[PDB]
Amino acid sequence: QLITVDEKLDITTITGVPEEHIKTRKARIFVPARNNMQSGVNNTKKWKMEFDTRERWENPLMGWASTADPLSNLVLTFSTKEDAVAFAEKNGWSYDVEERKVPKPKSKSYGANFSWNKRTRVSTK
Amino acid sequence: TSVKPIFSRDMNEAKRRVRELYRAWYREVPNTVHLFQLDISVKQGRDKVREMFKKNAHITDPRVVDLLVIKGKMELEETIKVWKQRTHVMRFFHETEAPRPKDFLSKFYVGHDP
Amino acid sequence: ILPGAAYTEKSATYVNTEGRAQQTKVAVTPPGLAREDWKIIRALSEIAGMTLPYDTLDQVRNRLEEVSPNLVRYDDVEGANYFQQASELSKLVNQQLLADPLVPPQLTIKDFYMTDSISRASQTMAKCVKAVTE
Amino acid sequence: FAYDGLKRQRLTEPMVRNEKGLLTHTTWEDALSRVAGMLQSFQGNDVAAIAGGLVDAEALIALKDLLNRVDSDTLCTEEVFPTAGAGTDLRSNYLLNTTIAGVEEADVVLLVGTNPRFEAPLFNARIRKSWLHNDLKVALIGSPVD
Amino acid sequence: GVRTSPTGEKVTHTGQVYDDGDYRKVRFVGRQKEVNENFAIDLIAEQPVSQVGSRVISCDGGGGALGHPRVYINLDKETKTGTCGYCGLQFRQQH
Amino acid sequence: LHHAVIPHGKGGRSSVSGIVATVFGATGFLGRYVVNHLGRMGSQVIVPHRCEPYDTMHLRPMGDLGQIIFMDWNGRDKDSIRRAVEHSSVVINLVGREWETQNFDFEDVFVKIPQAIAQVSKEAGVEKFIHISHLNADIKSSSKYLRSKAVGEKEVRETFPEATIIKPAEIFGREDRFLNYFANIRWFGGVPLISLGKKTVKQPVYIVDVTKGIINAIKDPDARGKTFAFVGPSRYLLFDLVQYVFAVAHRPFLPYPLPHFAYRWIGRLFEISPFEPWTTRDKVERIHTTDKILPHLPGLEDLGVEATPLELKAIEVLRRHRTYRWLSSEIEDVQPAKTIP
Amino acid sequence: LGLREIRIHLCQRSPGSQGVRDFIEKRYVELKKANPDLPILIRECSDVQPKLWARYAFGQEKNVSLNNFSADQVTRALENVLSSKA
Amino acid sequence: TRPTVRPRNDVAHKQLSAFGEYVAEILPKYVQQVQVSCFNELEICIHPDGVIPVLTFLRDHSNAQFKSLADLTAVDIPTRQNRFEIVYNLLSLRFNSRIRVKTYTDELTPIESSVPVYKAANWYEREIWDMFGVFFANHPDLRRILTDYGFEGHPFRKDFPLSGYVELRYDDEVKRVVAEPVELAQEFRKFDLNSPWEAFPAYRQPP
Ligand SMILES: NC(=O)C1=CN([C@@H]2O[C@H](COP(=O)(O)OP(=O)(O)OC[C@H]3O[C@@H](n4cnc5c(N)ncnc54)[C@H](OP(=O)(O)O)[C@@H]3O)[C@@H](O)[C@H]2O)C=CC1
Ligand SMILES: [Zn+2]
């Protein structure tokens, strides 16, 4: 037999996270920008959730990068913006959502390179 | 919003399980101090138990309450059966953590953490 | 001297020439004892018994919204109107145009590389200036 | 390529003037107290601030609120904008109201007293894009820069 | 070569040396600072330039498959030598 | 600040406190707590030791990798002191001994050595200097230990005028020679006391309080050049204190009166031991000395430490002195001691 | 304790800001002529409730909702601020 | 039979497909999906209400006889509203065959305990509760099994950090092991490894 529970989903007290890392963090929900060094677009398909960067310092012995932020490497993947937002809400994280950036559709034409009277005529091939 | 319950049909039934757990913990503190040979008093132990229940007083979902109670009973059983060691019982008191002042200026002086 | 954070070391709001507000993100933390710039002013206000009413980045951005609500509309270009009224008021007082020709501060590439404090401290920007002047 | 300026000439500690008049490292507690003492002793037009070019809005409003609370209104920027008429009352008076992407829809552009190539290189690139693809006509009042 | 700072601490081939006032040099008191003495930048300079009769020479570091990936070096500029990007050996085109 | 000593982190084991501290006498009761608290927050600790390296092993787990550094030193070799302090920003002197030995007398460990450490530290540019004296230090004291503390405390304040001098009462803790000393009197049956302990008053202080006071003195600019007195929250009659010790340990308490000359004679009896004397004539004197009241000096509350009552920590020290029958007895089972209001 | 600054927030297209849009269209020029040295910052933003903010000496601010006000009501809300100073 | 390519086995593919729809015909009340992979593994995806009826049928039916529970585990997929996928891997000795039964649940919905069907499931469900926080109803003895006593959180969830939140050391002052907030001398270095070029067109999702 089912029951009715109309309140919002809030699992912050049964996830075991320290309170500091719930209420002081800022999740960013975004689709990663394409790496401009490459033309492939396969890494701009899914939504990502990451957290705000915190202090890294140099280890006195070696000079390694030390951190005290347990969430420094936490990155989650979501199919849609709604999935990511819903996950952030139930875990108690404040968040910013950045709208997906899709490349504009362009009008390409090989013929324009040899225009009779336009500036698109190319001086070299 | 029709969901399968865990134990409690509504908050009224859940708060009954909460009170039952609180009694069990409250009676158990005197044995825990004695058995684990802790250097704290029964008053401190019961104040700590009270502080643990209080942090969750704002919940209104019966399913969440049920899971908190389930974990509370698991925690109590670990203590009663001396599966926990003294180090585990004392981790609730964070005796080695230095104070971390919680006012804007104090944090500003020490670092970038909000 | 109060050491503040550079644009790479804070989540801070900037408005471009369109009026489009955008925010940076913390890439690294400020060096040494440097601190987030708005926190320095908030900390000073408390020491001087004049505490500003915002303790977090979210709250100070609420304060921004109370002064200009477009400053929290990130990535949005907010239209502005009433050019007619601005032109009407621009006629009330007449001022003389000087005879000096319009000469921009930067006329060639060598003037482009060092314009702010960061680029002036850049050793790479110094290499570029040397390259285009020798 | 200017990011390498972020590893040089950095301010890393608060400084105050010592008894010989030279800047010396000090704590945040000491530095802010010397500032607060002066701020508590001045009012109105005796306190002013100047914001530089790379200043974020959060610091700008925090500084304004602090100076207003000593009844100061001399919050200035280094970059001038004429205050005659509407001044800064109307955003349209000091904005690029056509927006950057709008350059692609213009058929004429008049540049007055500017060198967009170096002042806004990406904006100038947008103009050349429209010059190339939409046969935009461009005229300039000012020095004949390339 | 391995120099010493005005404090006496040896300077590594990467130019590292604790400065006068860096507490971290206490770790060497009663012990020593490990510093390799054979600086590879000086050793590779000792090698003589090799004279070849072709515009393009190949290098694999020597030893066949015990060397580095084989690369081809252009020797058209006379103002300088071609340098192997892996092993640093230098080549020049004779007249 | 030199870039290498700007604090970083969240005050934990892998953080950077900015403190570079040479701790002389780190291998004793007070040393292990001071070194523990420095290493907790990622300080660099230099530990010059006279002892065998086996006896410093308990200090090794106290700091992250590279943060505890050990050197050899000799209290009479001024060069060895220079090597240990020349890189530090603060020097802490915990050196001391409760008995004289063939090689070192109270003047050596409480005057000559503290003076030499302070002198080398000053010449080396060391900025902070914390020196532990004693609450009951007095040039007129009947104890050579307390007379040398008064002299050494004067010489330290002259060599290093900006030193912080801390004057603790008798310190109680797990490895103390205080509560443990009284509890160990049980092997002789009755508990001798001069005038049955009704003429003496003590104000003992918890070890952790002294430790936290030392650590705050390092970080507190106001602490430079000052002299503090670290005392517990309560004053007790020596008779009531020892009675409480035997109650907490559940051992039979059979106090009897012993006059001063008799107690002194036995003190010499135990001084014959070439090892660590169980008691001495000097030790008997200090235990029966009244703890001075010094309202003019700042105290633990001035450094932010809230003194810990003996009633809350006695079981922690004295539980191991019970038999199997009474091991599990809880803290509240024993009624406290009358505190001199 | 005088008046230091006025800010008017409104939407460019919502019907709730129509009265504020009319006031700026018809009366802002004359209002500015009477107070040349008074900053009157108009800041439009999409889908905001119109409000009139007034800043007084020492950073005291009060705000008045202008939602659904007519142009005449906007003139009174501003007249009360420019006169009933505080 | 190209030497570097794994050979297909269509006979096994056919047999498992036929049995897949056999199970779907018999338990339509609970079966939501049946699929056979290109390397011949059969999966039955069911409604969580069907855990006991479906597992009982596969164990006891004369044409199934999946007597052995090889493995019981969970997978966390945060993008799903029911983020936890519960996976039963069963073995049939009689028919020398394997089958996978999958269902789902969220953080707050109990799953019926399968100990009545397979006594092997006891510890597997304790592990799932410990590492994922999925509650199993009517478990004779549900409690942590792998994590430390008093451990907070469920480490195998995708939003639990790799190094956790606390670490242990020995403290001389309190003379015991203590737990403190985690600090790393060297932070784990996240690598971004995925190539921006698609690898497998056969699996491309529609845009
Ligand atoms: N009740 C108390 O404990 C009180 C103590 N104090 C003072 O606090 C300081 C330390 O207290 P505590 O730690 O209890 O004393 P401990 O005897 O417990 O430790 C003494 C330290 O001094 C070192 N030391 C002793 N003699 C020499 C020497 N001749 N040459 C070199 N090092 C030496 C010891 O090193 P090793 O391990 O090599 O012997 C040890 O590390 C002392 O100055 C003491 O007077 C003050 C008030 C009360
Ligand atoms: Zn080579």
Q: Do A57 and F4 touch (CB under 8 A)?
A: no
Q: Are F197 and F245 in contact (CB under 8 A)?
A: no
3-state secondary structure of G18: helix
Question: Which helix (H) or strand (E) is H112 found in, with range?
Answer: strand H111-112
Q: Output the six-digit token pair for E7.
A: 């404090």
Q: Quote the tokens at residue E75.
A: 């020797």
* Separation CA H78–CA D141 (nearest Å): 59
DSSP sequence for A73-96? T--EEESSHHHHHHHHHHHT-EEE
**Residue F155 CB less than 6 A away from ligand 1:** no
F331 Cβ closer than 6 Å to some ligand 1 atom: no
Torsional sign, CA E22, E24, E30, E35: negative
Q: Which residues surround ligand 2, an ion (CB under 5 A)?
A: E 59, 61, 84, 86-87
The SS3 of residue F191 is: strand
Which residues 92-131 of C have a C-beta within 8 angstroms of D? 92-93, 95, 101-107, 109, 111-112, 116-125, 128
The burial of H65, by beta-carbon neighbours within 10 Å (0-12 exposed, 13-18 middle, 19 or more buried), is given as: middle
By C-alpha distance, the chain B residue nearest F330 is: B34
Token code pair at residue E18: 């604790």
SS3 H89: strand
User: Six-digit token pair at F146?
Assistant: 């307390």
Task: Output the six-digit token pair for H31.
Answer: 């079966």
Query: In sequence order, what E strands does C1-134 have?
Result: 13-15, 21-23
Per the CB < 8 A criterion, the answer to whether F20 and F4 are in contact is no
Nearest to F229 by CA among F137, F165, F167: F167
Verify whether ligand 1 is closer than 6 Å to residue F7 (CB atom): no
Q: What is the DSSP string of F217-232?
A: HHH-GGGTT-EEEE--
Report domain extents, chain G.
Answer: 3-82
Which ligand 1 atom lies nearest to the CA of residue F93?
A: 43
Cα end-to-end distance, chain B, whole Å: 37
Do F62 and F36 contact (CB within 8 A), yes or no? yes
Fold for the domain defined by G3-82 = Glutaredoxin (3.40.30)
Phi, psi of F147 (to 5 degrees): -70, -40
Q: Give residue for tokens 């004289």.
A: F100
Contact C85 D53 (CB under 8 A): no
Helices (DSSP H) in chain B: which residue ranges?
11-36, 42-54, 62-80, 86-90, 104-110
Q: How far apart are CA C56 and CA C54, in angstroms?
A: 6
Nearest by CB: F36 against H173, H180, H183: H173
Largest CA distance in chain H: 70
Q: Who's near E34: CB < 8 A, 6+ residues apart?
A: none
Q: Are F85 and F207 a contacting pair, CB within 8 Å?
A: no
H or E element that contains F265: helix F260-271
Backbone angles phi, psi at A61, to 5 degrees: -70, -50
Three-class SS state of F70: strand
The total number of residues written for chain B in this structure: 114
CA distance linking residue F212 with residue F300, whole number of Å: 9
Quote the tokens at residue A64. Answer: 């390694």
Q: Side chain identity at E85, as an amino acid letter?
A: G
Q: Which SS3 state, helix, strand or coil, does residue H69 take?
A: strand
CB H87 within 8 A of CB H100: yes
DSSP 8-state secondary structure symbol assigned to residue F16: B
Question: Looking at the partner chain, which of D9, D11, D57 has a beta carbon nearest the beta carbon of C34?
Answer: D11
Residues 6 or more apart from D78 whose CB is under 8 A from it?
A: D50, D51, D52, D53
Single out the residue of F164, F201, F187 nearest to residue F291, CA to CA. Answer: F201
3 state SS of F192: strand
Measured in degrees and rounded to the nearest 5, phi and psi for residue C66 equal -75, -10
Taking CB atoms and an 8 Å cut-off, how many pairs form between chains C and F?
5
Cα radius of gyration (chain E): 20
Picking from E33, E47, E36, the residue whose alpha carbon sits closest to that of residue E2 is E36
Residue F244 is inside which H or E element, if any? helix F238-248
Q: List the structure tokens of H27.
A: 């338990």
Q: Is E15 exposed, middle or buried (0-12, 13-18, 19+ CB in 10 A)?
A: exposed
Concatenated DSSP letters for chain A?
--EE--SPP--TTSS---THHHHS-EEEEEPPPP-TT----GGGSSEEEE-----EEE-TTT--EEE--TTTT--EEESSHHHHHHHHHHHT-EEEE-PPP-PPP----GGGGG-SSSTT--S--
Q: How far apart are CA F263 and CA F280, in angstroms?
A: 9
**Residues of chain F positioned with their CB less than 8 A from the CB of E23:** 2, 4-5, 20, 44, 87-89
Q: Which helix (H) or strand (E) holds F31?
A: helix F29-40
Which residue of D126, D127, D133 to mutate against A (max A Cβ within 10 Å)? D133
Q: Which of F277, F259, F278, F289 is nearest to F144 (CA)?
A: F289
Distance CA C108, CA D128 (A): 18
Ligand nearest to the CA of F204: 1
**Chain B residues whose beta carbon lies within 8 Å of the beta carbon of residue A5:** 1, 3, 61-63
Residue where the block lists tokens 């270095």? H189
F71, F49 Cβ separation under 8 angstroms: yes
For residue E86, the ligand closest to its alpha carbon is 2
Structure tokens at C115: 């314009």
Q: Is G53 on the interface with C (CB under 8 A)?
A: yes
**Contact (CB, 8 A) for H139 and H117:** no
Question: Is the CB–ligand 1 distance for residue F321 below 6 Å?
Answer: no
Shortest distance, CA F6 to any CA of chain B (angstroms): 11
Ligand approaching nearest to the C-alpha of E62: 2
Spatial neighbors of D88 by CB under 8 A, at least 6 apart, are D81, D94, G39, G41
Please identify which residue in the block is written with the tokens 């006896």. Answer: F55
**H76 - beta bridge partners?**
H84
- Residue-number span of the structural domain to which B32 is assigned: 1-114
> What span, in angstroms and rounded, lies between the C-alpha atoms of F320 and F328?
10
Q: Which residues contact B90 (CB under 8 A, 6 or more apart)?
A: B38, H174, H176, H178
Smallest Cβ–Cβ distance between F4 and the set E24, E29, E30 belongs to: E24
Helix, strand or coil, per DSSP, at residue H180:
strand
Q: Which residues in chain D are contacts of F6 at CB distance < 8 A?
A: 12-13
Contact yes or no for H184/H163 (Cβ under 8 A): yes
**Cβ distance D49 to D76 under 8 Å?**
yes
* Alpha-helix residue ranges (DSSP H) falling in chain H: 10-26, 51-60, 121-132
Which residues in chain D are contacts of G39 at CB distance < 8 A? Answer: 87-89
Taking CB atoms and an 8 Å limit, are C82 and G45 in contact across chains?
no
**What does the block give as tokens for B40?**
């704290």
Domain of F301 in residue numbering reads as 1-341
Nearest chain F residue (CA) to C33: F6
**C-beta of residue H112 within 8 angstroms of C-beta of residue H137:** yes
Bridge partners, F255 (sequence order) = F191
Q: Total domain count for chain F?
A: 1
Sign of the torsion angle spanned by Cα atoms E73, E78, E81, E85: negative
**Residue C79 CB partners (closer than 8 Å, separation 6+):** D97, G12, G44
d(CA B65, CA B69): 6
Which residue's CA lies nearest to atom 14 of ligand 1? F29
* Amino acid identity at G46: S
Query: Are C37 and C4 a contacting pair, CB within 8 Å?
Result: yes
Give the helix ranges, DSSP H, for H79-198: 121-132
- Which amino acid belongs to residue F223? A
Number of domains making up chain B: 1
Nearest to A90 by CA among A44, A29, A22: A22
| Closest atom of ligand 1 relative to the F104 alpha carbon | 29
G37/chain C closest Cα distance in angstroms = 13
Residue with tokens 């207003």: D68
Nearest CA to ligand 1 atom 36: F51
Taking CB atoms and an 8 Å cutoff, what residues of chain A touch C36? none
Q: Which residues of G touch D (CB under 8 A)?
A: 4-5, 28, 32, 39-44, 55, 57-59
What are the structure tokens assigned to A61, written together? 């012995």
Give the DSSP per-residue string, chain E. ---B-TTSPBPPTT-----TT-GGGGGGTTS--------HHHHHHHSPPEEESSSEEEE--SSGGGS---EEEE---SSS-EE-TTT--EEEE--
Candidate of F22, F24, F27 to mutate for ligand 1, largest count of ligand atoms within 8 Å of Cβ? F27
- Specify whether the CB–CB gap between G66 and G20 falls below 8 A: yes
A·H CB contacts under 8 A: 95
Token pair recorded at residue E71: 């690369």
Measured between its terminal Cα atoms, the distance across chain F in Å is: 48
Phi/psi at E4 (5° precision): -125, 140
Which is nearest to F93 in space by CA: F77, F106, F107, F110?
A: F110
Of H44, H58, H40, nearest in space to H94 by CA: H58
E21–F2: do the CB atoms touch at under 8 Å?
yes
User: What phi and psi values does residue F302 have, to the nearest 5 degrees?
Assistant: -70, -25
Give the atom of ligand 1 at the shortest distance from the alpha carbon of F25.
41
Q: Are B107 and F20 in contact (CB under 8 A)?
A: no
Q: Is C70 helix (H, G, I), strand (E, B) or coil?
A: helix
Q: State how far the alpha carbon of G65 is from the alpha carbons of D126, G50, G84, in Å.
A: 42, 6, 17
F110 CA closest ligand 1 atom index: 43
Report yes or no: F11 at the B interface, CB cutoff 8 Å: yes
Strands lying side by side in the sheet with G3-10: G40-44, G3-10, G51-56, G60-65
Angle at which helices G18-34 and G71-83 pack, to 10 degrees? 40
Encoding tokens for residue B27?
A: 């009676």
Beta bridge partners of H97: H92
Torsion angle in degrees (nearest 10) through CA of F27, F33, F34, F37 = 130
Q: Do chains E and C touch (3 or more CB pairs under 8 A)?
A: no
The sign of the CA dihedral H95, H100, H103, H107 is: positive
Residue bearing tokens 């030392």: F214
Is the CB of residue G65 less than 8 Å from the CB of residue C91?
no
Residue F26 Cα distances to E26, F49, F66, F124, F134, angstroms: 18, 8, 17, 21, 17
At F112, is the secondary structure helix, strand, or coil?
A: helix
Asked if B85 reaches chain H (Cβ–Cβ under 8 Å), the answer is yes
SS3 content of chain D, % helix, strand, coil (to 5): 40, 15, 40
Q: How remote is the CA of residue E50 from the centroid of ligand 2, in Å?
A: 12
Are the Cβ atoms of E26 and F72 closer than 8 angstroms? no
Which numbered ligand comes closest to the C-alpha of F81? 1
CB within 8 A of H133, min separation 6: which ones? Answer: A14, A15, H107, H154, H157
The SS3 call for residue H11 is helix
Burial status of residue B113 (CB atoms within 10 A of its CB: 0-12, 13-18, 19 or more): middle
State the closest ligand 1 atom to the C-alpha of F149, by its place in the atom list counted from 1.
Answer: 45
Q: Which residues pair with F208 in a beta bridge?
A: none
Ligand 1 centroid to residue F186 C-alpha, Å:
25
Give C99: exposed, middle or buried? Use CB within 10 Å, 0-12, 13-18, 19+.
Answer: exposed
Distances in Å between the Cα of B45 and the Cα atoms of B42, B51, C41 are 5, 10, 43
Residue nearest to atom 11 of ligand 1 (CA): F30
Query: Residues of D with CB below 8 A from C81's CB?
Result: 92
Task: Inspect the interface and report whether the beta carbons of B68 and A13 lie closer than 8 Å.
Answer: yes
- Residue of chain D with shortest Cα separation from A118: D135
Residue of chain C whose alpha carbon sits nearest to that of G28:
C85
Cα distance between residue F289 and residue F200, in whole Å: 6
Under a CB-based contact definition with an 8 Å cutoff, are residues B18 and B62 in contact? Answer: no
User: What is the least distance, in Å, from the CA of C49 to any CA of chain F?
Assistant: 23
CB E55 within 8 A of CB E74: yes
Bridge partners of A4, per DSSP, are B2
Phi, psi of F236 (to 5 degrees): -125, 150
Residue E21: phi, psi to the nearest 5?
A: 125, -5
Closest protein CA for atom 44 of ligand 1: F96
Compute the distance between CA of residue G71 and CA of residue D88 in angstroms, rounded to an integer. Answer: 23
CA distance A23 to chain D (A): 21
Q: How many residues does chain H have?
A: 207
